[model samples]
Target chain A: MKKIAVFTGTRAEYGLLYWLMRDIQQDPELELQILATAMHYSPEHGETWKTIVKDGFEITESVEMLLSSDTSSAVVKSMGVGLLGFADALKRMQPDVLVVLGDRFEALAVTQAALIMHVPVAHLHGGEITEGAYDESIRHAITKMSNIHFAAAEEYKKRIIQLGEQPERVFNVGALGLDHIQRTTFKSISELSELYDFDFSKPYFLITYHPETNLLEENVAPLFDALKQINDVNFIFSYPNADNGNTNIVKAMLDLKAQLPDRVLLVKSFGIQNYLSVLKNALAMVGNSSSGLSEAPALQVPTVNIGDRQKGRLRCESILDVRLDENEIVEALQKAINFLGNTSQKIIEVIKTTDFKKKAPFYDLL
Target chain B: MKKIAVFTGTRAEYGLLYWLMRDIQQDPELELQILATAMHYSPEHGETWKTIVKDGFEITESVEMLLSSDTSSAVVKSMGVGLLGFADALKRMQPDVLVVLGDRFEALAVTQAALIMHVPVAHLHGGEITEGAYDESIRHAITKMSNIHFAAAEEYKKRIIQLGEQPERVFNVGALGLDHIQRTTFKSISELSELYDFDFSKPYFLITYHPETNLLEENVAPLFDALKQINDVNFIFSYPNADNGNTNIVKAMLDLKAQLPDRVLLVKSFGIQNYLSVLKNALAMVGNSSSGLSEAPALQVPTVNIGDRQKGRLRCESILDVRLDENEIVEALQKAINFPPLGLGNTSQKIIEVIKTTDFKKKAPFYDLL
Candidate 1:
């Protein structure tokens, strides 16, 4: 049996990686080893590794390398510590192959450790661009360091090859994030509200905006102004990640909630079940989170994607793109809440046919 | 005046970068800041930073970041310390441009810190390939991170552009290493003997070799076997750098020395002046060091380059490449002892001519993939 070590640094990516971990566990010839780091270790981020344990997957090790600060130096030194931490962790849980997903400093650290340890790394969703953030560059660099690649789209697959990887090593397995909506049974709207103690009985909109770390300047107050001006619907807000300007977003979110308490319900995290369940029943997702680009559309909910965070992905017809300006955002949300049909059905068509064992969205580790 | 921070990690690269550093200091519109690190900081390597100071240049700051061990993990973590050290140094120095030269892990680390800081970097001697070693890969990675490049040859300049750097930003200023030999007035054989106490009056060969760090297995004894077979020339050896398999090479060197005591002489370091002094009078340079490919020929001396360490570089007519087999190496050295000549023009002035104020040869940042 080939031992496959899949690394996850946060709850969100772990949720998306759920089905593939199950696929690996089920296979007689493949063994699954899960390694967790970053936000999963931070108490402020809900110590999300507990949620993974609740999902019944055993975490082989944890690399507690994330510092409380989000300044660039701290983040870089955390990468250094991560290099040392993963070196020891990989030694304890020696596997045939190392599987890392996505483009974060945490992933970069683990991949650097793998390179030094002489372990071949399998990177996910490489070659997808995010022009407004440092991730696009980090993603491309990881593509160079990686030996095997699992791209979510055909274009991403070709892009990885263009970065000098041989074609035989890269596989386009379709998007793994879409597999959850396809395979898992979702909770009803009432089931989500009862568990979270939040009333989703009314028509509510999901909202989230992470910091674009590459942008030199950030002023997200106008985005809240756009939401505050909107009437006749509840806006469910989640905390942003540990990016540079996330604290700015948090402060603006609280101010918007105070101005209109009844219309805004600030939630810590909906976890995964409640998140998709609420998305399935919401009027729309009105923010710039990556999930708004794919997950909401998969649930047949429209999104009013504000600003440059979501710029580089393939445009699903359901997303109404607008600037962070209050008028532009309000008008886009008004139209999107009335929009109909699941645009990702075409995406789902391509993803459903992909045999994870033969190819990849965790496609080729077999 | 625009402040340019130039980083040097080894004496070898610093020697090449010397004249350019002088030019940077000399320019009325330019201010020079030198950041030293790696082997320059190591006491084992004779703290080569002092050599830089003695050469009459002020070192702005020293990054004491090299770990005592040469394990892969230690080297990588040293890079970690380097990232932190350079982050603080760049913040402290706050130079307008950061000038880095060649492909050592130290240069790569400083380049990374510069990239994160959004500092534009001017790289020198990019686009040379060493397929047998990891430096080739590190070299390419730095090329991706750097904004302006000063390549040593036309082919090297083209190779940098091929690696997806903009064509305009990459400059072919020729080899600065060659410029040093053309200008230096060499010591006569007797003067070289008086300083180093070595008899260069005898027909001898200068030799050095670096470990091919990427090689999983190394057996360099056959190279000594070929040397042991040669009847009558003195062998002047220099110590290899701190890399994997270097100790093995040293052991093999000692074995060859003990086997032929009168004919072999190994020194700690040739220190540049005596190196050139002795090199000008040697029969040939016999080893796989990079000098066998470039320096020896530029000095009108032949080289018997053994094995693959110097592969993937443009060669001059004065050198012969051979496998580790005893016979091929012996024959190559036999022919090379008598063959030598070279041709090149001024490179240091062109490198010194680079202006940090204006847009580099890179006219545009083309976003599309080729």
Candidate 2:
């Protein structure tokens, strides 16, 4: 059997990889080894590992690398600690391939350790763009170090090839998040409402906003406005990751929840099943999140993307961009809701029947 | 008068900026404000600020940003400390333009503070490539933050413009180091011999090899093989900077010096004048340093570049690529020694002359002209 080590550091990463983990387990030839680190373990980053366990997947190791301090210097130092810690784990485990996804600093640290240990790395979500955050550059740098590239789209695949990696080594795996939509049966609106203890009779929004750690100031105002505008819609807000401005985002959500008691429901960590179920049933997914761009389209979910956090990543037609202004957000929300109601048949058929098998591997379809 | 804040962190950065600092002082309309940090003040990094003072440049502020611990975490903490220290200095100095060169982590910190403070940054050597070092990416990132770019070559200038920077903000000012070569009447072979108390009659090599800090094993074996091959020629070596594999390179150089004391002369630092004079008279310069490609070509000096440290940067005809083998080094040195004697006219004179006209202006060159 092929021993594959899959590493996750944040709630969103875990959510995207959840379906893939299941696929790996079901495959007769593949043995899945899960390594969780960074924000997944921290309450400050929403204690996302709880979500992992709730989803019924066993975590083989928990590498505590991220400190509470949020400075750029602290981030770099944590990377060093991560490498030292991973060095021991990797030596003991000795897997065939190490799997990592996206552009987090923790992922870069893991890649460095893997490179030094002479282990081949399989990188996912390569060739994406995000110029504002330092993660943009870090992602490209990691792509160069990786042996096998699993890009999300054709454009990203071409970009990986342009960076001098052999074309044969690259696989355009139409984002693993898409697999959850295809393979899993999401809970109905009433079912999700009972699980999370929130009334879903009224139209509501699923929210996930992360901190733009590279920026100097905290992005609190925009997030606050997003929460305040979506007040009419029952707010199903997910917690932020453990980036620099994460504490501020969570505080704003809590403050909003207190003001609108029965109207707001905040889930600290949503396991993959319930999270996708919430996405499927929600009136619109509101906030600056990659999930809205990458996965929500396939679920035929309307997404109200706010602020500059997810500006440069690939977006599907399901996403509507909104400025921080209250009126703009209101207009965007109305338009998204209208689109969802008017175009439900066309959108659902387009998403469900979309061919993910053209020139890409089975994993790429996920 | 235009107040210019000049920040130098490494010995190599100091060497390139020395002439520009002098020119800034001599200009009636320019006032130079110096802030020294990072390896310049570190004993482990050769305490290179001594050379700055020896060159007669006034030290305005000395920020001790390097932590005692040499781990990756320490380096990151140093950057934060350096940013805090420089932010204070910039507030007090309130210079019109903050000048930074190259792509060291400390330089990145300085640039970060200046950007946050809304200070216009004047970046030098903006558009160059170094595949071996992480500096390549850092350099481009700095270019995006800078308002005014002083590129070393026309090709580099074009690259800066290509990166969506307003063409009006970029200037092809050649290299500041090239200005020193053009203007400084270097010491004769006899004067250099008496100053360093070394024989100049025999064919000698000037070697400056810094750690390719990003690489895993710290390429020391190849450097040693090149050093050991030259028995007839005297070797004047400068110690590596405070990088990951710096101590290893220093140890290798020291061991070589121990075996051949009469033939080897190792120094902690060399001032601009002495360094240029030695390079001008040396039989050949051999190393993976940027100096070999940028300055040596301007001085009509021959350079045998080894390995990938200076790889992918623009090369002049003066540089001869050689592998880190004994035979390759000896063969390249022999070729370089004979090639210069034929008086084949300076290959880089036209480009060097174009570079010398870059005077300090109140506004950026491209902005003013275009």
Candidate 3:
């Protein structure tokens, strides 16, 4: 069997890569080796590794890379330590091909080590643009370093090719996260409530807000104000990631939840299975998180994106861009709730036929 | 007098803003309000504010937004605290126009507070794409928030207009840093040697290496190896900024310096005068720092830029791109030293001329001007 090493650093990455991990495990030709780092091992980031294990994947190696220090220098130093750790780990595992996803600092470290070690790398989500954080530049940098490119869309594939990567090595596999929605047998509201031990029969909102690491602190107030006004819906808040300013947003969420416990459900780590299960029943997904734009839209769910973090990413019809104000939040949620109720069937039908869920034939051929 | 507020967060920003700050201070209609934050106050970042104070600009407020801690969460919380503090500071200062330059998190905070507080912002270096470390997005975001746009080049001016900012407000004022290089009289080798107690007559190199905050830790080693191979010239090292892995690079530089004490001088903060003065006579500028690309080219100084942090930025003839390998670094430096020296008279003349003389015409100007 060909040893295929897959690395995941955060819950966001694991959530997207879950289906691909499953497919690798099921495939007879490929032996999946999982390397988890960054937020995956941290309790602050919800210990995302537990979720991976709960979903039934063997944890081959867990490299703790993310430090609590937030300054530019400290972050860089931790990444150096992470690289040092990865150098040893990759040598021991020595997988046939190392797979990395997204444009993250940790993924950059992993790819750099692999490159130095002369190991071939397969990169997923290579050409997407998120002009918000340093991810936009990191994405392009990773593209140049990666050997096998699996882009999410046609435009993204073209972007990868434009970066001088061989066209034959690039493949548009749709979004792997979207593939989960299409292929997985997701739990219904009743089943999801039973699994998480939470009653979600009532109208509830799913929220995932990551740090807009690059934005000034003053810019985050509008997002907090918007979150404060969300009183009517039972808010299910997911933890923020390792980006700068995430703690402020997460703290604000925690503080708000304290005042309105009956209306909010705070969770640190919701594994891929439970996260999708929660999203399936959510009335309207709220926040500037990319999942709302990328995954929620595919489920025909309405998403209220507060700021410009995921500003330029391709979005489905379900996303409603709103200013970070209380009135705007209230109005957007009202419209989204009404739209969800009135066009439920048509929305699902449209989403089911969308290009985000289609799988390429190369997987079967391989 | 117009209460013109200028916010500078990093050393590189201070370098660019110094000449403009002097111009604003000298302007009869303007009262300068300098707000310093980020690495300017940090001891690790070389306490760059001393340089700022030495230049004769009074700092109205120093908002401590940077957390000594290096986690993403701390960085985020610090921003929130910084925003709160800056919001209070802007309210008190009540500047007519807030001038912010380039793409740093602190600049973004200042821009946000000023925009919300109804302070018209004039952004310098608008519409440049560094894409590294999320500055590319922040640059565009600031351009969108800013009312008056001051660009370093004509192409940048066009980009600002393309981003939907009104063309009337955008001015291509050339690079302000180049203005200092033009106006400031550098001390001769003998004078500088006497002032700093260093021999300036020898072939020396000026180095500035910032952490490409966006990349992982493993990627920086090759670049460090490249910096280590230059043993032939006197080395002047500028400390890395507050990016991730900056500490590692600094540690690496310090280790290298220990063995080459006479050859390498690690100066923390060289005030704009001394920095420009030193660069005036340096053999070559080396490292992954953006100065090697943007400023070095204009100075007609040869720059050996290592790695991909500045892969897509505009490059002039003075820059020699090389990989992080020792062989590549040595070859590039040798080639740079061998290349026909660009006469200082012709180099940076157009950029310097434009920056030193451009007037900010007061059409529909607001705040303290009234």
Candidate 4:
């Protein structure tokens, strides 16, 4: 049997990787090896490695690499520690191919380790561009290091090809996260309302805004101010990621929740299934989360995307891009009242059918 | 004054970066900071950091990150250790720009550290490709992270621009290593012969073979077998790099040296100046070293480049590309005895001019093809 090791460094990536992991776990010809590290082991991130076990997949290797800090230097050091741990993890596992997703520093560290240890990396979301974070550079750099590319769209596959990856190795497998929409038995509005102890039947907006690590301004103030002025519309807020400026974003959101205790529902997490259910019943997905741009549109909800965080992504008619000013955000959010919008199994079949020993040649554009 | 920090992790990189380091040191408007790490600090590699000090530059930071072992996991751990050291080093010596050359693992670690620390990197030799090594991937990866690019040729510059760097930011500075040719006062043949206690009048070939890390064969056997067959000509041998398969190559070379002690001069290193001078007076450069690709050709010496290690580089008229067979290597060397030679500026000056003129940002806009 071919041992396919899937690395999950964060809850969000694992959520997106859920179906692929499930498919691999069920495939008799493939043995699923889960190497959970970084945020998965952090108690502050809720020790989500337990969630993988609860979902019935064995954690083959749990690498503790995050230092409890958010400084850039700390991130670099964390990657350093991760490299030390991954060296042993990869050497011992000796899997046929290692699977990695997204543009986080953890994935980059693990990918570099795999590259040195002679492990072929199958990278998902290889060519998408996110302009206002360091993820943009990390994503492209990972593309150069990876062997197999599973891009979400054809445009991304073309960009990955332009990045010098061979066209044959790159697959336009569409977004894997969208598989949740088709396969998930989402909670009804009544069920979500009862679970959260919040009235989901009211007109509401689902908000999730992460810090723009590349931008040099406080991004949450204008976004929060715009959300504050809208009366009677319930605001369901999900926690931002654990980036450098995350504490400040959380503090501002907490203060906003304090201002409107009954009107706001600030959840640390709703889990993936519950979050999508909450998202499906919302009036609009407001905030610059990638979900607002990708999943919300597919759920036929309008997105009010603010600031440059989501800049350079492939835009759809459902996404309304706005600046970071309160007035501009409010104007876009007002217009949000009117609205809108596959490849996970193919990723499995491709991995199953691939010859792991084949050399990845660089494809030059003609 | 702009603080420009230069990183040298290997002797070859330091040699190629010599003039630029010198230029930066002499510039009145620039303060040069040197961070020598990796092989430069390895005792087995001769602690080349001391050579930088002897050459009249202050070693701002000396990081030791290489393990004694040559396992692939050790290399990964070494890069990890390098990243940890570079984190502190870059934070302490906050430079306006960091200059790195080439595609070694040390450079990748340093470049990633600089990227996270928000330091703009000015990369030299950005787009050249060497197919049979991991350097091919590392080179392009470094280009993706770098802000300013100084390519060695027009083709390299175009390739860097094709790799999404803005054209205006990438200048074809024409092989900075060739600056040694126009500037160095080469050691006289008698002087080199006296220093090394070797015969001066004899015709010799400078041979430096590094292990092809990507290939799975015994790469040195055929090349050594071919060199052993050649009787009259002298062979000057330099040590291969400390990569995974290095010990075997060194053992083979030592075995050959024991057999042909009268015909071979085995030196661990000849320093940059002496090596260039030795290269100048050679009959032909016969090896898989990059020196045989770029520097040997520029010196108008014929190069018998053996095997796939130097494949995919721009072929100059002076180089004979041959496979790793004893007969083919001998034939190439016989042809090489007859053939003869082939950038611009003050390459460092052009690099300085362009770097000073451009406003570097942490993230560059990816230049798309039309």
**Which one is best on lDDT?**
4
Scanning candidate 4 chain B in windows of ten residues, the lowest lDDT window is B337-346
Clashes of each: 7, 1, 21, 0
- Which has the higher lDDT value, candidate number 1 or candidate number 2? 1
Per-residue lDDT of A288-339 in model 2, one digit per residue for the tens?
Answer: 7777786677678888887766767777677898755667777888787787
- TM-score of candidate 2 against the unseen true structure: 0.71
Tens digits of per-residue lDDT, candidate 2, B1-370, equal: 7777788998777877876787777767678889888888888656889988888888888788887874444554565467557756776787777888997767766765565454567788887766632455456656655667778777777766654355766776667666667667788888877877878767778889777766666657765666676467788887776567878888989988898888888777776677888888777788888778866776778898876788777776788998655667777877787882111222123222322334422222111112
In model 2, which residue pairs have backbone atoms overlapping below 3 Å? A173-A364
Evaluated on CA atoms against the true complex, candidate 2 attains a DockQ of: 0.05
Minimum summed lDDT over a 10-residue window in model 4 chain A is located at: A336-345
Error of 3 at A330 (Å): 1.2
lDDT of 3 by residue, B115-188 (tens): 44457677888767565434554566566556677777666676665544456677776666666656777778
**Using alpha carbons, what is the TM-score of model 1?**
0.85
Model with the higher DockQ, candidate 1 or 2: 1
Q: Write the per-residue lDDT of candidate 3 for residues A1-366, one digit (tens) a residue.
A: 667789999888887777667767876767889998988878887777888888899988888877686543334444545665675677778877787889877786676566545566778887676655555545655655566777777878776655445566677777777767766677778877786677889888898777654454524556556656655567888887776566677778878788778777888877666788888788888887778877787777889887666866787778898866677877888787898121212222222233321111111110
For all candidates, state DockQ relative to the true structure.
Answer: 0.20, 0.05, 0.03, 0.68
Candidates in descending DockQ order: 4, 1, 2, 3
Give the C-alpha miss distance for residue A249 in model 1, angstroms.
1.8
Best by TM-score: 4
Model 1 DockQ reads: 0.20
Instruction: Pull out the clashing pairs in model 1.
Output: A173-A360, A359-A363, A360-A363, B168-B361, B168-B362, B169-B361, B169-B362
Error of 1 at B351 (Å): 5.6
